[PDB]
Design a binder for this molecule. Structure first.
Ligand SMILES: CCCCCCCCCCCCCCCCCC(=O)OC[C@H](CO[C@@H]1O[C@H](CO[C@H]2O[C@H](CO)[C@H](O)[C@H](O)[C@H]2O)[C@H](O)[C@H](O)[C@H]1O)OC(=O)CCCCCCCCCCCCCCCCC
Ligand SMILES: CCCCCCCCCCCCCCCCCC(=O)OC[C@H](CO[C@@H]1O[C@H](CO[C@H]2O[C@H](CO)[C@H](O)[C@H](O)[C@H]2O)[C@H](O)[C@H](O)[C@H]1O)OC(=O)CCCCCCCCCCCCCCCCC
Ligand code: CLA
Ligand code: CLA
Ligand code: CLA
Ligand code: CLA
Ligand code: CLA
Ligand SMILES: CC1=C(/C=C/C(C)=C/C=C/C(C)=C/C=C/C=C(C)/C=C/C=C(C)/C=C/C2=C(C)CCCC2(C)C)C(C)(C)CCC1
Ligand SMILES: CC1=C(/C=C/C(C)=C/C=C/C(C)=C/C=C/C=C(C)/C=C/C=C(C)/C=C/C2=C(C)CCCC2(C)C)C(C)(C)CCC1
Ligand SMILES: CC1=C(/C=C/C(C)=C/C=C/C(C)=C/C=C/C=C(C)/C=C/C=C(C)/C=C/C2=C(C)CCCC2(C)C)C(C)(C)CCC1
Ligand SMILES: CC1=C(/C=C/C(C)=C/C=C/C(C)=C/C=C/C=C(C)/C=C/C=C(C)/C=C/C2=C(C)CCCC2(C)C)C(C)(C)CCC1
Ligand code: OEX
Ligand SMILES: [Cl-]
Ligand SMILES: [Cl-]
Ligand SMILES: [Fe+2]
Lengths: 450, 36, 34, 341, 81, 333, 30, 61, 37
């Protein structure tokens, strides 16, 4: 059974470590956990829909899943306005039913099915140290992930499109007909610096690049899956890695930690695949919106915003970036790399154009600037909107704040877990994870350092 | 002596603690000290 | 066999009886309206 | 045998809860201090001493409840229940902040009783009394902060109120009015506390990662036996590891554990000395040379001068409500503030 | 190992719950009624939500004299706050 | 083979200081950061941190002392932009805009991550269990939070912690003004972690020192009763457990030394993990609890609490911090 | 009202430990 | 068919509760397993049918 | 809001998302029943 410390060597608080050499029960654990994930997706979608007020913006209602469905072009119209809440309901309900199916399978393999799959089948039974089988399973899952990326491509190209916040006239659901298949453009995002003004793959600012990158990712994942089904690890790969279940877990933990940090930065900075109609403005967006709002107000009052001098001698409203571009003044000079659909019509070749600023600011831009200024991603833990010194009137914390904070916590803890399991896999492969042998202590066989 | 299993005692006591602290958070959102 | 009322009994009840009393009090406070 | 010896024998019997001679002082005082804090944070207001709601009955949560200090006009009165201020009226005694002095005095005598308990148990089981010597540092902190500091000031009002947000107020008050971060005694206290946390973490991790394999279970906690004569971990391996990682390492276990005693105790004692200095308003508030230069040169700026401006903001913006007895009416135009905001 | 019945043995006994399913709810109800009848306000002098201020008053009833503090509190209470 | 000899030297356990491959990255970055820090702390010219052409003096030669000196963070005009030496036209421009801060913090973060890796590496070479690096991940996460993650969330390396004592105090006070860190539960967990770490450090030291087995006289130090590498236990854990189990009660006392030392490792590390996560989650502006005007009487008058007094202090810091840098009512970042 | 949500969550939160109790009562593989 | 749709969804909820309690109990009790096997099959089939019914009755309600 | 034909199932939906947390708690309950063996 291996369901106690004496038989397994693991205490109850490490009891899932008893599942390492038990393929059937481990499969049950995985399938039940996948059922848990799908259950949260469906139940959270239904919870968010049940409290959804469609006339209020999504970012004011504490929603994180409905904006994801809206970004896919389901249920929304021009400007992000909800036209139909039934697709959200369908997504939630189908996830809940599929989660019931996955929970049934997980429970069956965990407590009723065979504890080891090796006797029942050679296809499904696996040994962790069988490199060929591990690469085969990895190849199957790579093909599955590539099919998922191509499913996003299919939704964007043939099944209604995606919400484009950069669409002409305003954000709208648009079918992407010309994805960027150029490897220079696609793989130029991977070579971009992660620092200010460059932003690496977080700086993707159009859906054509998104769809082209997903075509490339789906094709690459399918090709790599076929590659790992057809091949065995090479000698350098065999000598460079530890080949055990905990080692593979630690590799995945490091990868997931990196992806968690990337997603944190993506939801904090990107407003293309996280449109500000659904997720609210970014921090840079809100600061630029405040500067824009007071520029409009004082320009209506008669101020010459190009020549107004702030207290320090810099431009109160307009100043120059370190490379000469005309940018908004004040502290929001740190956010001059921000690009947004409401701000781009006033940007010329040298930055913000003074003539367009004087003559071309439309009322929808003013409404957007005021709305994004007053919905800055700043809030308290008990969902009080505004700075830490604000009074209790506004019940608002941005979804960008919730997603970024939660996934930074998760990414850091998964880095810690990767360190734990990588060290433990190395020690267990080397044979001293349970401590130092008294009769063969290595340090006692080493010369002194004086 | 051991007529009622200890796991039942622990489960019931923990559920009571959970109910009490959930009531305390609900009262943080309702009545006195709710800012409304 | 075992005595019932000890020093340990006194310490436990001097901590536990006011704890339950105060918990009931604060639970009643949760339904107070201004 | 005499009544004293019989009572001593009963007091030193082995129980679930040891009592001892020190128990007579410890258990009443400690129980009364804890019960007073819970009773105050549950039922007792600060409306007449501070103009604050500070109880669950008024709608505060766990972070914002406090047993607040007495009003400033009470001075350093002991505020006994039978004393001339309360005159035996328990309700008025609660309303005048008598629960604060109740908790403070019973807590002080409970801490005395606890250190006496440490001494008595150390004598009984035949061990050296280094735990009581280590506990002298939290006693020094409590005496300096809750007793010596208000005695140096005008009243009990400026002592910490027994509460979470009230203690946060105490921290911010010390920053704004005393520049307590700039005090070298507080710096030694911070060094002692953070070094003690570092030593705790690093010693625990070092022991857990140099354990001898004394069992075949993956969970290594079972392998230790309480009465074994051998070290459960390798001191030689740990010493070599830290010698090659950090340059220096412990080689004496007794010195290691004395050092673990020494660092946070010394830090807390230094911080208590600094708190006595602040009790007399003898602050490390300013550096005179930088003050003179910044006065004579409006382009000289350091983080210290920025901190001074922050302290001016703290004092001006918190003084009318944190000190209601002064009747501070600061008009809007006298409040220091930067541009905008 | 000190001469008392172990806590696990006591709290798993039926007789313990026979006593305590009566005593624990009685104490809980006693605290609930201590708050809900308003006896806590009278015992500890805590203002009711209608008792912090007089109807037009926005000043805080702060005691300013040491030996007349009881009389000051009674005057503040007599002011219909 | 030359490469094989170099690999044998790098991974050698006979070097006085272990190098390893994490060390071949760690040593140059830490040396660069240390040398640049010493040179900047002594002799750097004033730095325009706010980007408002009001330079802040941080070095000893320009009027500071040990307490007030700092390496000032890079300019707010730079923001999150990468600012190496070769991106500046001259060294005078680089020093004006706070380039040494970026150089030092990037080299230090790289070197400290490789220090964690090097701790793992030496533990592996010596046949140890590998989780000392996991314990070191808590201060490393704290350093990443205050030097990298908070600038990323706020959008400028000017909001990172200055490399100095008074600059650190400025960072603390402005952070409390803008995020109410004291009312954040993660920082409260961190304070519990460090207070408990000091408590359990003093407790473990005093209990072990209390139960030291007599091997000396009153003339000599008790520390000479222990010899390096002795097999026998230098103190009686049974006596210490008896003392502590009579001090509180028996089942509150560890009798397993391994469990006790795991607790000593686990408490401050988890607490500091949570406070580093607190700094990062307030970097994404998820601030501490806001209870301002929470208690309301029957008519609707605000009844102040201690949280409102904290709010007054925070308002003072907020209106005075960076007194020339704001042009608009909301301090959005 | 709120009583409906409380009834639902009570039924689910007892449905868990009911599974555990039923397995312990009939001496299951638990 | 709003009352019919509500009845079908209520039946689905009640059967989901019954199976959520009973499937782990049946799986972890070998002693009567043969009999419980048939019930599990029946329940699964009925549950699937109820889901389909509700889905179709979603669009005519 | 949900579609109106699902309206009477609104309270149940209101308690659905916290079900995964209970699963974690359920593990401990199970481990308490076997005595944390
Ligand atoms: C630090 C943070 C690190 C990062 C993690 C962030 C995400 C964590 C996810 C938490 C899941 C459960 C949250 C929940 O259900 O959270 C919801 C509830 C609060 O309920 C609702 O909370 C709401 C807050 O959300 C939303 O409120 C508005 C909606 O009208 C706005 O849209 C706003 O932006 C949005 O945040 C409102 O205040 C409502 O009035 C109130 O009913 O949290 C509660 O009480 C929480 C329950 C208290 C138990 C204590 C925790 C146990 C210790 C371990
Ligand atoms: C022990 C514990 C250790 C923990 C360590 C944590 C390490 C992980 C931290 C971040 C990693 C991921 C960084 C990333 O994905 O990097 C990408 C992000 C994104 O950067 C921002 O990206 C933005 C991209 O958005 C642009 O394009 C968008 C398109 O929608 C919008 O239009 C937007 O307005 C517009 O500005 C801008 O270019 C910003 O100036 C730029 O700072 O970088 C950033 O914040 C990161 C800044 C540099 C990080 C360097 C460290 C890594 C080497
Ligand atoms: C995602 C969470 C998760 C999952 C999927 C698992 C899964 C598993 N654990 Mg596990 N565990 C977890 C969390 C989890 N654990 C946690 C948090 C702890 C710490 C307390 C443990 C501690 C632990 C120990 C100590 C051990 C396991 C073991 C096991 C395996 C055998 C279980 C068994 O025989 O129990 C039998 C128990 C029962 C039959 C009781 C009923 C449980 C059922 C499954 C509840 C189902 C409820 C659900 C509502 C049903 C829906 C059905 C519907 C969809 C039709 C199994 C694969 C064991 C193992 O390794 O096996 C070798 C083992 O010894 N676990
Ligand atoms: C996909 C991710 C993943 C997977 C599959 C595993 C798998 C495993 N881990 Mg691991 N781990 C992970 C991530 C992961 N880990 C991360 C991210 C960390 C860093 C925190 C760790 C840290 C870690 C340690 C330190 C140890 C393991 C161990 C183990 C083994 C036994 C685990 C067990 O029985 O848990 C039993 C489960 C519990 C006891 C429950 C823990 C409860 C958590 C800590 C609190 C969760 C709070 C919740 C999210 C929010 C509050 C809820 C509310 C109710 C209060 C198993 C092979 C053990 C090992 O090495 O065995 C070989 C071990 O000692 N893990
Ligand atoms: C990762 C998931 C996974 C994996 C690897 C397995 C693996 C296995 N299952 Mg299992 N199972 C699962 C999920 C899974 N199952 C789920 C979710 C359920 C609930 C319905 C079950 C219910 C179940 C039962 C009742 C039994 C098994 C059995 C088996 C074994 C033999 C099955 C066989 O020959 O299939 C042959 C192949 C097929 C029958 C074709 C299936 C085609 C599917 C439906 C295509 C689905 C499309 C796509 C790939 C899935 C995407 C889903 C995703 C979106 C969530 C094998 C070890 C048997 C066993 O162990 O006997 C001893 C057995 O009796 N399983
Ligand atoms: C989930 C995805 C996944 C996983 C886990 C693996 C796993 C594996 N692959 Mg693989 N592969 C995949 C997808 C995946 N593959 C796909 C999609 C393709 C098609 C493009 C391939 C094509 C492929 C080939 C052609 C080969 C492998 C090989 C291997 C094995 C050795 C890995 C190794 O040493 O690389 C670790 C990485 C390196 C050694 C590269 C150097 C590390 C640099 C310095 C890191 C730089 C990145 C840095 C972190 C910055 C990030 C940003 C940057 C990208 C700009 C291992 C079993 C090898 C093998 O044994 O084949 C059987 C091999 O030759 N893979
Ligand atoms: C042994 C434990 C102990 C200790 C050390 C204290 C100590 C204290 N209590 Mg306290 N208290 C205790 C137990 C204890 N209490 C218990 C069990 C209760 C519950 C009933 C209380 C209830 C209580 C209240 C309600 C108050 C105190 C207060 C005080 C403080 C001032 C008391 C004072 O001045 O009287 C000093 C009295 C003595 C030292 C006794 C003198 C004994 C010698 C032998 C002389 C006896 C002379 C002769 C025999 C009799 C004289 C009669 C006649 C000539 C007048 C002081 C710090 C007050 C306080 O905190 O103020 C803020 C307060 O108001 N206590
Ligand atoms: C192994 C194990 C475990 C685990 C388990 C798991 C994890 C499981 C899973 C499970 C799952 C994952 C489950 C699921 C379920 C579900 C269900 C059963 C559902 C149903 C549904 C329904 C009935 C629906 C309904 C509706 C609709 C249709 C619409 C409207 C709304 C409503 C909701 C009404 C534990 C930890 C305990 C430990 C021991 C062992
Ligand atoms: C453009 C675009 C896109 C795309 C993207 C892509 C195409 C990506 C890819 C990417 C990739 C393609 C990635 C990769 C990565 C890699 C990594 C991450 C690596 C790792 C490595 C490792 C881990 C190694 C290690 C080592 C060392 C260092 C030494 C020796 C030993 C060992 C081996 C351990 C998307 C979709 C977003 C959309 C939008 C746009
Ligand atoms: C002052 C006074 C007095 C005293 C009294 C007393 C001594 C009382 C007591 C009282 C008490 C003795 C009370 C108690 C209370 C308690 C409570 C109210 C509790 C609560 C709790 C809770 C709520 C829980 C929590 C927790 C934690 C802590 C952590 C973990 C988690 C949890 C959440 C579970 C006399 C008469 C002498 C004289 C006159 C004056
Ligand atoms: C969707 C749906 C559904 C489903 C559901 C489910 C899936 C459920 C499950 C559930 C569950 C799965 C539950 C569970 C619960 C649990 C509990 C409530 C527990 C708690 C715990 C505690 C309280 C603990 C305690 C303790 C112990 C025992 C030991 C140590 C200490 C302590 C204290 C921690 C139904 C059918 C209704 C129908 C419609 C819809
Ligand atoms: O730079 Mn450093 O501290 Ca963060 O909030 Mn906005 O920016 Mn400035 O004011 Mn407040
Ligand atoms: Cl400042
Ligand atoms: Cl500004
Ligand atoms: Fe030790």
């Amino acid at each position: 059974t291996n369901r106690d410390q004496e038989s397994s060597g693991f205490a109850w608080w490490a009891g899932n470590a008893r599942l390492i050499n038990l393929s059937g029960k481990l499969l049950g654990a995985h399938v039940a956990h996948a059922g848990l994930i799908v259950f949260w997706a469906g139940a959270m979608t239904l919870f968010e829909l049940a409290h959804f007020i469609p006339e209020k913006p999504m970012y004011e209602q504490g929603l994180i899943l409905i904006p994801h469905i809206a970004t896919l072009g389901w249920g929304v119209g021009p400007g992000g306005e909800v036209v139909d809440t039934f697709p959200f309901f369908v997504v939630g309900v189908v996830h809940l039913i599929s989660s019931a199916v996955l929970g049934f399978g997980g429970v069956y393999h965990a407590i009723r099915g065979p504890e080891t799959l090796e006797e029942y089948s050679s296809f499904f039974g696996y040994d962790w140290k069988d490199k060929n089988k591990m690469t085969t399973i990895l190849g199957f899952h790579l093909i599955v992930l590539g099919i998922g990326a191509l499913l996003l491509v299919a939704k964007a190209m043939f099944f209604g499109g995606l919400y484009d916040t950069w669409a002409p006239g305003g954000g709208d659901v648009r079918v992407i007909t010309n994805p960027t298949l150029d490897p220079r453009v696609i793989f130029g995002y991977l070579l971009k610096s992660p620092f200010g003004g460059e932003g690496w793959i977080v700086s993707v600012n159009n859906l054509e690049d998104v769809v082209g990158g997903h075509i490339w990712i789906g094709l690459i994942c399918i090709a790599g899956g076929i590659w790992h089904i057809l091949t065995t690890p090479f000698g350098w790969a065999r000598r460079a890695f530890i080949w055990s279940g905990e080692a593979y877990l630690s590799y995945s933990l490091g990868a997931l930690s990196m992806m968690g940090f990337i997603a944190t930065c993506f939801v904090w900075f990107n407003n293309t695949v996280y449109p500000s109609e659904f997720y609210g403005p970014t921090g840079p967006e809100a600061s630029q919106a405040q500067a824009m709002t007071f520029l409009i107000r004082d320009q209506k009052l008669g101020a010459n915003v190009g020549s107004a001098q702030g207290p320090t001698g810099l431009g109160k409203y307009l100043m120059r970036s370190p490379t000469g571009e005309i940018i908004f003044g004040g502290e929001t000079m740190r956010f001059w790399d921000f690009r947004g659909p409401w701000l781009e019509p006033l940007r010329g070749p040298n930055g913000l154009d003074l003539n367009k600023i004087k003559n071309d600011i439309q009322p929808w831009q003013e409404r957007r600037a005021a709305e994004y200024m007053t919905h800055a991603p700043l809030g308290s833990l008990n969902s009080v909107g505004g700075v830490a010194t604000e009074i209790n009137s506004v019940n608002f914390v941005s979804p960008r704040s919730w997603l970024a904070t939660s996934h930074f916590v998760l990414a850091f803890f998964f880095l810690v877990g990767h360190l734990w399991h990588a060290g433990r896999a190395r020690a267990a492969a080397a044979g001293f994870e349970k401590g130092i042998d008294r009769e063969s202590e290595p340090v006692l066989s080493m010369p002194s350092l004086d | 002596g051991g007529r009622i299993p200890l796991w039942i005692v622990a489960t019931v006591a923990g559920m009571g603690v959970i109910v009490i602290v959930g009531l305390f958070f609900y009262g943080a959102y309702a009545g006195l000290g709710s800012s409304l | 066999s075992y005595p019932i009322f000890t020093v340990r009994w006194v310490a436990v009840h001097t901590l536990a009886v006011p704890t339950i009393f105060f918990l009931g009090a604060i639970a009643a406070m949760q339904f107070i309206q201004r | 045998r005499g009544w004293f010896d019989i009572l001593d024998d009963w007091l030193k019997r082995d129980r679930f809860v040891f009592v001892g001679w020190s128990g007579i002082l410890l258990f009443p005082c400690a129980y009364l201090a804890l019960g007073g804090w819970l009773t105050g944070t549950t039922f007792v207001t600060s409306w007449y001493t501070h103009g604050l709601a500070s109880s669950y009955l008024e709608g505060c949560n766990f972070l914002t409840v406090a047993v607040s200090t007495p009003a400033n006009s009470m001075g350093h009165s002991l505020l006994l229940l039978w004393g001339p201020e309360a005159q035996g009226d328990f309700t008025r005694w609660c309303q005048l902040g008598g629960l604060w002095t109740f908790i403070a005095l019973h807590g002080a005598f409970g801490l005395i009783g606890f250190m006496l308990r440490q001494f008595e148990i150390a004598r009984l089981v035949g061990v050296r009394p280094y735990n009581a010597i280590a506990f002298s540092a939290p006693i020094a902190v409590f005496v300096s902060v809750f007793l010596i500091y208000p005695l140096g000031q005008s009243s009990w009002f400026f002592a910490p109120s027994f509460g979470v947000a009230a203690i946060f107020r105490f921290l911010l008050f010390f920053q704004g009015f005393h520049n307590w971060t700039l005090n070298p005694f507080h710096m030694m206290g911070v060094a002692g506390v953070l070094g003690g946390a570092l030593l705790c973490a690093i010693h625990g991790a070092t022991v857990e990662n140099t354990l001898f394999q004394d069992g075949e279970g993956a969970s290594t906690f079972r392998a230790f036996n309480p009465t074994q004569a051998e070290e459960t971990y390798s001191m030689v391996t740990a010493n070599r590891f830290w010698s090659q990682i950090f340059g220096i390492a412990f080689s004496n276990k007794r010195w290691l554990h004395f050092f673990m005693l020494f660092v946070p105790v010394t830090g807390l004692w230094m911080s208590a000395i600094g708190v006595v200095g602040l009790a007399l308003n003898l602050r490390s508030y300013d550096f005179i040379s930088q003050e003179i230069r910044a006065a004579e040169d409006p382009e000289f700026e350091t983080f210290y001068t920025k901190n001074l401006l922050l302290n001016e903001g703290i004092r001006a913006w918190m003084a009318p409500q944190d000190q209601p007895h002064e009747n501070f009416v600061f008009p809007e135009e006298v409040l220091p503030r930067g541009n905008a905001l | 190992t000190t001469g008392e019945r172990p806590f696990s043995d006591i709290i798993t006994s039926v007789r313990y719950w026979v006593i305590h399913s009566i005593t624990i709810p009685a104490l809980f109800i006693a605290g609930w009624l201590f708050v809900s009848t308003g006896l806590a306000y009278d015992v500890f002098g805590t203002p009711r939500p209608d008792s912090y201020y007089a109807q037009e008053q926005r000043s805080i009833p702060l005691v300013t004299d040491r030996f007349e503090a009881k009389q000051q509190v009674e005057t503040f209470l007599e002011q219909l706050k | 083979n030359l490469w094989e000899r170099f690999c044998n030297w790098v991974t050698s356990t006979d070097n006085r200081l272990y190098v390893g491959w994490f060390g071949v990255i760690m040593i140059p970055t830490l040396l660069a950061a240390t040398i640049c820090f010493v040179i900047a702390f002594i002799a750097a010219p004033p730095v325009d941190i706010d980007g408002i052409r009001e330079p802040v003096s941080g070095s000893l030669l320009y009027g500071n002392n040990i307490i007030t000196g700092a390496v000032v963070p890079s300019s707010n005009a730079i923001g999150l932009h990468f600012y190496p030496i070769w991106e500046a036209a001259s060294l005078d421009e680089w020093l004006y805009n706070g380039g040494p801060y970026q150089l030092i913090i990037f080299h230090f973060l790289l070197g400290a991550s490789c220090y964690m890796g090097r701790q793992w590496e030496l533990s592996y070479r010596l046949g140890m269990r590998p989780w000392i690096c996991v314990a070191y991940s808590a201060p490393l996460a704290s350093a990443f939070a205050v030097f990298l993650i908070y600038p990323i969330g706020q959008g400028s390396f000017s909001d990172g912690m200055p490399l100095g004592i008074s600059g650190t105090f400025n960072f603390m006070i402005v952070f409390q003004a803008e995020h109410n860190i004291l009312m954040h539960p993660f920082h409260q967990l961190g304070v519990a972690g460090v207070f408990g770490g000091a408590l359990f450090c003093a407790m473990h030291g005093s209990l072990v020192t209390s139960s030291l087995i007599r091997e000396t006289t009153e003339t000599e130090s008790a520390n000479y009763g222990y010899k390096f590498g002795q097999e026998e236990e230098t103190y009686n854990i049974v006596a210490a457990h008896g003392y502590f189990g009579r001090l509180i009660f028996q089942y509150a006392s560890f009798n397993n030394s391994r469990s006790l030392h795991f607790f000593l490792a686990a408490w401050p590390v988890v607490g500091v993990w949570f406070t580093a996560l607190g700094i990062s989650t307030m970097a994404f502006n998820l601030n501490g609890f806001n209870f301002n005007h929470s208690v309301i009487d029957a008519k609707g008058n605000v009844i102040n609490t201690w949280a409102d007094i904290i709010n007054r202090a925070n308002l003072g810091m907020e209106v005075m911090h960076e007194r020339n840098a704001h042009n608009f009512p909301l301090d959005l970042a | 009202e709120v009583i409906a949500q409380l009834t639902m969550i009570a039924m689910i939160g007892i449905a868990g430990p009911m599974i555990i109790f039923l397995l312990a009562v009939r001496r299951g593989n638990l | 068919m709003t009352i019919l749709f509500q009845l079908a969804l209520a039946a689905l909820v009640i059967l989901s509760f019954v199976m959520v309690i009973g499937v782990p109990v049946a799986y972890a009790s070998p002693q009567d397993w043969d009999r419980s096997k048939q019930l599990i099959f029946l329940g699964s089939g009925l549950w699937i049918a109820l889901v389909l019914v509700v889905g179709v009755l979603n669009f005519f309600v | 809001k949900l579609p109106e034909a699902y309206a009477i199932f609104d309270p149940l939906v209101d308690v659905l998302p916290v079900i995964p947390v209970l699963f974690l708690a359920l593990a401990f309950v199970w481990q308490a029943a076997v005595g944390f063996r």
